[PDB]
Ligand binder design. Structure first.
Ligand code: 672
Length: 241
């Protein structure tokens, strides 16, 4: 997260950290139920030197605050039983960049580990609404990750403006969130994390999945996120949640 600040401990109990065998933190995810997490499909694409698609190559840390303190009280460690990438995901266009990760063993709800609420299919997060992006990603484009979880406040951007800012690249499954002037944006390592939207009663709903961006916090290059409402039914049919 670029342009953010340290989150308070336990402030985002649904934020999950995903480590790949021997590589440390690679992606974030969100707790949506005792056995399921939501993340981005691009995190689980194999490459010649590592099978990111293999659930056994990953470890999920729930309740984590500081990467250098992964054993602290309240932190839970879990392995993945399965990784379900959206069948329509496209590595080139990045359309349908969303994934469901099934935990090997049930997460235990506590004050530091709590699921985020999922928005119904017809819900629309309005342009201009303040949203929160969180993660252990780089704090600068061309910088380094963060030990302490970061949070940044950004705003939903009009779809038309989004398409126009990134011509031939924005699909209806994507949503621009941030600022045209930059300043605050998610970045490398934040991929797969959730956008948290405070709703009518104070409860927080996932407004999106950190997907991609041209650089980070660059002027006229806001972060692009995968929408959640559009996948409510997909999530239900695959996870029962
Ligand atoms: C080599 C390619 C893919 C690549 C593309 C980009 C962008 C121009 C699209 C970049 S980047 O810096 O402008 N942006 C990163 C970091 C990022 C991430 C999320 C949000 C933001 C934001 N500013 N809001 C930024 C980026 O949008 N990605 C997405 C695409 N990407 C991948 O799909 C890799 C995932 C891991 N992997 C496998 N498991 N096989 C290889 C492919 C990497 C990060 C980069 C960076 C890494 C130099 C690379």
């Amino acid at each position: 997260v670029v342009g953010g600040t340290d989150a308070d401990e336990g402030e985002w109990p649904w934020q999950v950290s995903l480590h790949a065998l021997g590589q440390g933190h690679i992606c974030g995810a969100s707790l949506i139920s005792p056995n399921w997490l939501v993340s981005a499909a691009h995190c689980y694409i194999d490459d010649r030197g590592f099978r990111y698609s293999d659930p056994t190559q990953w470890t999920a840390f729930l309740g984590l605050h500081d990467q250098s303190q992964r054993s602290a009280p309240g932190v839970q460690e879990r392995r993945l039983k399965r990784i379900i990438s959206h069948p329509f995901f496209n590595d080139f266009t990045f359309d349908y960049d969303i994934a469901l990760l099934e935990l090997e063993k049930p997460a235990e709800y506590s004050s530091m580990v709590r699921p985020i609420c999922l928005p119904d299919a017809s819900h629309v997060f309005p342009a201009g609404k303040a949203i929160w992006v969180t993660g252990w990603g780089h704090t600068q484009y061309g910088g380094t990750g963060a030990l302490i979880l970061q949070k940044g406040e950004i705003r939903v951007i009009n779809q038309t403006t989004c398409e126009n800012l990134l011509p031939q690249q924005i699909t209806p499954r994507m949503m621009c969130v941030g600022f045209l002037s930059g300043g605050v944006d998610s970045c490398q390592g934040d991929s797969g994390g959730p956008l948290s939207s405070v709703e009518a009663d104070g409860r927080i709903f996932q407004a999106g999945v950190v997907s991609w961006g041209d650089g980070c916090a660059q002027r006229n290059k806001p972060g692009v996120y995968t929408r959640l409402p559009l996948f409510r039914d997909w999530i239900k049919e695959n996870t029962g949640v």
